[PDB]
Design a protein around this ligand. Structure first.
Ligand SMILES: CC[C@H](C)[C@H](N)C(=O)O
Ligand SMILES: CC[C@H](C)[C@H](N)C(=O)O
Ligand SMILES: CC[C@H](C)[C@H](N)C(=O)O
Ligand SMILES: CC[C@H](C)[C@H](N)C(=O)O
Ligand SMILES: CC[C@H](C)[C@H](N)C(=O)O
Ligand SMILES: CC[C@H](C)[C@H](N)C(=O)O
Ligand SMILES: CC[C@H](C)[C@H](N)C(=O)O
Ligand SMILES: CC[C@H](C)[C@H](N)C(=O)O
Lengths: 81, 81, 81, 81, 81, 81, 81, 81
């Protein structure tokens, strides 16, 4: 299961969150960004349940995460060169 | 220069736009997604001027692209495993 | 009176809120969802006043409810097969 | 495969879109609504590919459909009474 | 039945739409405004069905209306001094 | 000086905020509403400074007021019947 | 009268719009930008009527302007070093 | 490096935040505004790294700053008369 998750942090907590994210195997990329969202992660998990558990029970429970917006990727419309 | 671009298309045009983007050398990854955005692209250009020229004169002049939201990725806070 | 309520939760609270909602008689359906909203609920109440009281005094007083967006359904433009 | 799709129509086209939506078998419920969205549909498709195809090539190609926001429902966190 | 409708217009059409709205009996007040919305209107109709018909068939069929967001007012939580 | 202010409260505090708002002389009308906003107020102040001060130091300091969106009404494009 | 106006253009029309904006005396600054808006202008006009006329009758009528969001600046809370 | 930052504060904190920002040498202009954002700041830093460090460790660690939206200004599409 694949998704891109847009994260907003508490004001000023973006670097600390990025640091946490780096260590997790399900996070295949992570970037802090300018604009309306603060961090963009690509998440690859073994199943849709494991994606859900990861989003709800890890990412959304990390210190200083405020909100997440998970964009489920369409199977067959996804390319990483 | 690196950025993630959140694209909205005209309703129904997402597959057409996807296929256009995939063949562009500045586009390193592209995904159709469920939610408030339709396509997520990661763009890598040689310079910020070349990123601007790519976003404005290629991506945003594609048929059926309605809007774009470019998130400039912060140098030194960007990991692809 | 009937409505669909889009709920946002505090980060990580969406399963808990989902569980509280599921057991309430006015809730005819409830779903955790990916994207900009966390929980969608269909509410059926005997009147508009009881809809009001349910939204404000039950839904919006649940722990870890951050926001709600109640969409009143139009009488005569509503089908459940 | 199940989703709740939030639709905006071109101004004034909501009743016509509603009537088109109601006769589709993948649409198990459809409601015109007050607020920032115009119609709410629950879609039940046999698979995630059939969901994508119904969203992109049916819903998003209907006349007067301006935008959609598909919310993928979380398996195991979904109840219709 | 009563509501406040937030209207967005096509760029440059807000004075024209304002003028069409002003003369209609269901409109009890109307204002062009700065910000994310263009026009605020208070609507008072004899019933919820007539509210519906007014929003969809008058407001949303006005030339240069792009979008509307109708906020139904809660009975018993409404004061005009 | 006239404005329409859209208020969001902390979840569940809308009735308490409404009662506080209704006794203020600068508030000429106040309504709790369904949708993305929770309360709508029209504010009439003697001047733009008095508007600012009432928005910042009264409304935005009320307990359970989370955010406001003040829409400055355009002089000459405003009618209350 | 002072304001900052956030402009969204038709996809790809941002440079052409920026070029138009440069020539107008009421526009004291203009910038194209990455993210959810496309151009940021500072507008200084002689009065609130002249601000309104400029926004509605010039900026919002320019080719390829799609939307504008005008943020009225608070007198006494405005500094340009 | 140049950017315009759209700031939201805790309700009522806008004047406090304004006064904090005004004295910072990276802040070249600052305005409190009516609407969906509360403060607009223009930031000029010597480098993109210094912009990031300024946004994350100064602006977004100010008391009562709730969120920020940094719009990176496009080099060569930026005029201050
Ligand atoms: C460093 C950027 C931060 C996190 C935020 N997204 C902003 O645009 O202000
Ligand atoms: C499980 C998904 C959570 C609730 C949130 N809606 C997201 O998209 O990240
Ligand atoms: C009938 C309601 C329409 C479709 C729209 N959602 C509004 O709130 O104005
Ligand atoms: C196939 C998904 C489409 C593109 C849209 N983003 C939606 O959620 O409805
Ligand atoms: C006159 C204002 C126009 C209508 C728009 N609401 C803006 O803020 O730019
Ligand atoms: C009673 C309605 C509340 C305040 C909120 N606006 C909602 O739509 O859920
Ligand atoms: C004084 C204005 C405040 C900061 C807010 N932006 C509002 O519009 O309500
Ligand atoms: C050049 C940037 C354009 C205009 C747009 N704001 C974007 O972020 O895609």
């Amino acid at each position: 299961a694949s998704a891109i998750v847009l994260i907003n942090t508490d004001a000023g907590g973006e670097d600390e969150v990025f640091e946490r994210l780096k260590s997790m195997s399900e996070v295949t990329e992570v970037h802090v960004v300018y604009g309306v969202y603060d961090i963009v992660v690509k998440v690859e998990a073994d199943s849709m349940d494991k994606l859900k558990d990861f989003v709800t029970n890890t990412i959304r429970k990390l210190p200083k995460v405020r909100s997440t917006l998970t964009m489920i990727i369409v199977e067959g419309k996804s390319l990483v060169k």
